[PDB]
C-alpha cells in the first residue's frame, strides 16, 4: 500500500464524481475508502452546508488553510474517522479548486496530502493494523 497512490486515486474519484477528469488487494482499500468518504460526506452535509461553501479558498492561502484545518483535526488524536475526514477535506479543496477556476492547485493539494500521510499519519496507521484494518473496520458498513 502506497500513500501517494491512495491520495491520487481518491482525488481522481472525487473529481470524476463532479464531472471533472483529472490525470488487486490494493484495489480493495481504494474502493473501501471511496465508499467511506461518500458516507462521511452524506453524514456531514446532513448536519452542515456543503463544505465547499465554507472554504474561502484562494491560491495564496490554500496551503495555510490546508495545514491549519488538518493540524487541528489531528491535534488531540488520530482515529479512522478523522482519517476519513482528512481525505474528504482534501477532496473538497480539490473540488473547490476546480470550481473556482484554479485547477492546478489540485496537484499541490495532492502533494500536501501525501506529505501529511507519509509524515504524520503513517505511525498511527501502522500501529493500528494498517490499511487492512481500515478495510476490516469499515466492512460491515459497505453497501
Amino acid at each position: 500500500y502506497d500513500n501517494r497512490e491512495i491520495v491520487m486515486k481518491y482525488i481522481h474519484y472525487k473529481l470524476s464524481q463532479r464531472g471533472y477528469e483529472w490525470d488487486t488487494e490494493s484495489e480493495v482499500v481504494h474502493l473501501t475508502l471511496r465508499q467511506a468518504g461518500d458516507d462521511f460526506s452524506r453524514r456531514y452535509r446532513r448536519d452542515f452546508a456543503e463544505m465547499s461553501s465554507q472554504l474561502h479558498l484562494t491560491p495564496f492561502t490554500a496551503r495555510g488553510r490546508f495545514a491549519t484545518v488538518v493540524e487541528e483535526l489531528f491535534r488531540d488524536g488520530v482515529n479512522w474517522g478523522r482519517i476519513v475526514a482528512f481525505f474528504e477535506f482534501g477532496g473538497v479543496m480539490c473540488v473547490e479548486s476546480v470550481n473556482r477556476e484554479m485547477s492546478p492547485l489540485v496537484d499541490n493539494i495532492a502533494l500536501w496530502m501525501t506529505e501529511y500521510l507519509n509524515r504524520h499519519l503513517h505511525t498511527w496507521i501502522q500501529d493500528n493494523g494498517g490499511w487492512d484494518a481500515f478495510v476490516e473496520l469499515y466492512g460491515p458498513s459497505m453497501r
Partner: peptide, 22 residues
C-alpha cells in the same frame, strides 16, 4: 472559520468512528 471547519470535521469524524466501530 477554519476553526469552525476543523471542529465540524472532527465531530463528524468521531461520529463516523463510533458508528463504523460497532
Amino acid at each position: 472559520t477554519m476553526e469552525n471547519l476543523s471542529r465540524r470535521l472532527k465531530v463528524t469524524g468521531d461520529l463516523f468512528d463510533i458508528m463504523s466501530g460497532q
